[PDB]
Design a protein around this ligand. Structure first.
Ligand code: 36J
Ligand code: 36J
Lengths: 263, 264
């Protein structure tokens, strides 16, 4: 059944994490906002399909806020990957199918490139390679303004505003405090560190996705890179948060995709 | 410097309405499915000012080119349109050109690239239809008024700039009003499946493929994958389905720069 709790890793991070199911491991790395409650619904669906699912709030975000300052500053896919590996080590997860969007996606690719032995298959979604216009000066305004703007930006890219809104007051309160922290340590360093070089994409199977309703330009390069490297590339319903907008379709994708690499 | 406007009847019986501007290497602007060439007015001057003779026209059966046999606007495919264009190009004495086209215009560009490579200096396809959206699944079965109502809103939504779209004028929109039904009856059902996107259709001449920057990814997702896998230059243009209307300056710059690439 679903377990919820905390675990303090040797890097000082007091992780808030959840787990459900039995069977092969599936890890759901949240996006830049680091809020794992977004995976609640799909998590049950995936878990009921013969997989042990693990999710967690990201370092310094939401319930994983009790972490060293260093763990949420100058963030890169590889930096996050290191933290993830330490967490996986402590939870005794030897190998897993890994899902990730935005910064989570960058982490997935970092895992595939630097820790291929821990990845069964990677499922990156909308890897940031160039920050959009709206995030250029996000850190230059008051924290309250950052939360206001990012709350609007996120809701707009939710893929389903009713579902987004339906995440609940608790989640949205947590997100409120996350916005400024995310702005200060993610957007400027995440994109340039994207592990999308040829050397990063062939160690383990990868199934790449982008939002079906996401404006083409946003993650256009993701599609071209995948196609050029001969990596499976397709779309998922919604935009940036397919696990919130279309939990059923998201769960199905994670299950089928992961299931095909099992042996 | 001055816009040339006229009519010409080709051997196939089509009374074409066309426009031309500038002198030098030829640039042809094939309209989209709506076949309304007034959408290229602004960029037409911009491009022509850079040393190109630009030519555009209302598509057969559409707008001012409405006096055409019914077969020229029924069961339309990229190849059918290409045949007509070639005849027109012959009539206007255009030997080779840099050709632009969106939607059905894009299918036409690819057809030209595949079947009449000798007439194309470089192809610039934009949003080639390969898989119709659900909004068009049953558009050919409803009455003209409903088609016009729906397509007018549909088109405006895909304009990429509602203000510039609206600013096309009452004349244009009145012409568009009548084109909608005709388009629906002869394009959406047959254009997509006829898309000249086979491997052997894309490598006889240089091609520079584009998709709207604001267009929902899924709409022309296949265009991007095909291009990338086939090693064809692929990118985006600001706007959606009508970059020539929404962003005339950027559109003009793209056409000029890409065409320049293939000139000696
Ligand atoms: C915060 C989250 C979604 C915000 C909505 C935004 O509207 C999403 C726009 C796409 C980019 C998101 C992004 C860029 C970046 O450089 C680093 C990141 O961690 C993200 C990211 O995780 O996006
Ligand atoms: C009519 C024009 C744009 C209409 C707005 C619509 O919102 C455009 C939707 C995307 C595809 C348009 C299209 C599909 C097709 O199978 C054949 C076509 O000739 C077109 C086309 O030319 O699109």
């Amino acid at each position: 059944t679903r377990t919820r709790g905390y675990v303090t890793t040797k890097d000082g991070i007091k992780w808030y994490y959840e787990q459900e199911g039995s069977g092969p491991d599936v890890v759901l790395i949240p996006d830049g906002l680091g809020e794992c409650q977004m995976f609640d619904k799909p998590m049950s669906l995936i878990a009921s399909n013969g997989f042990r699912v693990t999710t967690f709030d990201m370092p310094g975000m939401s319930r994983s806020s009790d972490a060293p300052p260093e763990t949420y500053q100058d963030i890169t896919g590889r930096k996050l990957a290191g933290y993830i590996i330490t967490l996986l080590d402590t939870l005794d997860i030897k190998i897993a199918s890994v899902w990730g969007c935005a910064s989570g996606a960058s982490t997935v690719l970092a895992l595939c490139s630097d820790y291929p032995e821990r990845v069964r298959n990677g499922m990156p979604h909308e890897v940031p390679t160039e920050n959009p216009d709206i995030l250029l000066h996000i850190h230059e305004v008051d924290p309250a303004t950052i939360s206001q703007e990012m709350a609007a930006n996120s809701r707009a890219a939710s893929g389903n505003v009713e579902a987004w809104d339906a995440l609940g007051p608790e989640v949205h309160a947590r997100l409120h405090d996350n916005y400024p922290r995310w702005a200060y340590g993610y957007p400027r360093t995440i994109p340039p560190s994207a592990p999308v070089k040829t050397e990063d994409l062939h160690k383990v199977p990868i199934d790449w996705t982008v939002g079906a309703s996401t404006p083409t330009k946003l993650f256009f390069e993701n599609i071209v890179i995948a196609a050029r490297e001969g990596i499976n590339i397709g779309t998922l319903p919604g935009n940036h948060f397919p696990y919130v907008s279309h939990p059923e379709e998201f769960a199905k994708y994670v299950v089928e995709t992961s299931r095909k690499y099992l042996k």
